[PDB]
Design a protein around this ligand. Structure first.
Ligand code: HEM
Ligand SMILES: [Ca+2]
Ligand SMILES: [Ca+2]
Length: 367
């Protein structure tokens, strides 16, 4: 039967109401209403948790979106492909005891939904509840890495959950709010687009620009040349230059994915809706949705899309594009004014001094 929650929210099932206080606590204690570092790491964790499942290897290889990262924090977070996931894992573990009626699998996906809601332009994603509270650790080798080629990436996603090439590119819209801490051992928080706190299509445009240098070292595994490599970190600042992943470049130019990649450029609603649909599928890997309950109403309403059009960043323009898609013309877009590269802020407030919540915990990392 229907019910009304603590905060006035009408739900299809009263058990959804347990998520209201969880959302409040996730925000007050970790996310702080921001599309910042902790939000981004938690969104990354939804993927590392969910994708560790394999049709061909069978259920013993991994249970998908099952909270295995939180329940066995000494196993999967320490596999090489998940280096750095310890931060999100350690931030979420305390909520397991604070909200004991909510399974680890549900906690991971709900935290991701809440984190996304903090990012202007992100969709209000579906949230189904009821993932069982027990599982076992997945095997190693199920998480794509940035040095992987498109055939490998597409096969891994198909084997995980039957994702199509369009759905894979749609999921990679997440790199609009993504940065790298481990790819380059000399850089922290190297952003993948010029607006890492805005859920927009800048990532799609900016990967199509010609690379001209590197924000740090020039020979990291999984990294390729960036169109906007400079930052202020050589003088002690925290505004790291833009980084490009090999996998994003590869997706942008492969015949199976290039038109889907370009198709999101300056198509905000299409991008956000496409991400939402693919992400809802990701969030329930390892489950029959018949066995879950719809609690979508308790996902917060996201911050609205920004007013700003999609544009070329300062010092770039259409002459710098490397295009691969014959089926759709790249749209005419304005160029941001400026004679030098604009520093990409380290913080959503435009400054460099922001700090993030980090709980201590059992998961670890390396360099
Ligand atoms: C081919 C598939 C993918 C590859 C190779 C990949 C690779 C990466 C890499 C190398 C990083 C940087 C980690 C670091 O060094 O700190 C990263 C960050 C991130 N990834 Fe992806 N990723 C993939 C798919 C996804 C998907 C499907 C999602 C979610 C739907 C996702 C969400 C994120 C987010 C939000 C971050 C940023 C974390 C932060 O800024 O703190 N990724 N990814
Ligand atoms: Ca898992
Ligand atoms: Ca962005």
């Amino acid at each position: 039967p229907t019910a009304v929650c603590s905060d006035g929210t009408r739900v299809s099932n009263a058990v959804c109401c347990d998520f209201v206080s969880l959302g409040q606590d996730l925000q007050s204690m970790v996310l702080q209403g921001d599309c910042g570092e902790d939000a981004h790491e938690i969104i990354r964790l939804t993927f590392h948790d969910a994708v560790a499942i394999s049709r061909k290897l069978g259920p013993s290889a991994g249970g998908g979106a099952d909270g295995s990262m939180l329940l066995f924090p000494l196993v999967e977070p320490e596999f090489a492909a998940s280096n750095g996931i310890d931060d999100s894992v350690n931030n979420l573990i305390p909520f397991l005891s604070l909200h004991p009626t909510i399974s680890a699998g549900d906690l991971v996906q709900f935290a991701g939904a809440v984190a996304l809601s903090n990012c202007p332009g992100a969709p209000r994603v579906q949230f189904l509840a009821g993932r069982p509270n027990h599982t076992i650790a997945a095997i190693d080798g199920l998480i794509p890495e940035p040095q992987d080629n498109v055939t490998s990436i597409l096969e891994r996603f198909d084997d995980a959950g039957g994702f199509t090439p369009f759905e894979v590119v749609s999921l990679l819209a997440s790199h609009t709010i993504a940065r790298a801490d481990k790819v380059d051992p000399t850089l922290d928080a190297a952003p993948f687009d010029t607006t890492p706190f805005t859920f927009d299509s800048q990532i799609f445009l900016e990967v199509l620009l010609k690379g001209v240098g590197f924000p740090g070292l020039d020979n990291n595994t999984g990294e390729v040349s960036s169109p906007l490599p400079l930052g202020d970190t050589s003088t002690g600042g925290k505004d790291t230059g833009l980084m490009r992943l090999q996998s994003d470049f590869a997706l942008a130019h492969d015949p199976r994915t290039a038109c889907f990649w370009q198709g999101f450029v300056d198509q905000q609603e299409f991008m956000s809706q496409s991400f939402a649909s693919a992400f809802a599928k990701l969030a329930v890997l390892g489950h029959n949705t018949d066995d879950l309950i719809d609690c979508s109403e308790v996902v917060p309403v996201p911050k609205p899309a920004v007013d700003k059009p999609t544009t070329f960043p300062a010092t770039t323009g259409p002459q710098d594009l490397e295009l691969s898609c014959l089926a759709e013309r790249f749209p005419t877009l304005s160029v941001d004014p400026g004679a030098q590269e604009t520093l990409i802020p380290h913080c959503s407030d435009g400054l460099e001094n922001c700090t993030s919540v980090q709980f201590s915990g059992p998961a670890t990392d390396s360099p």
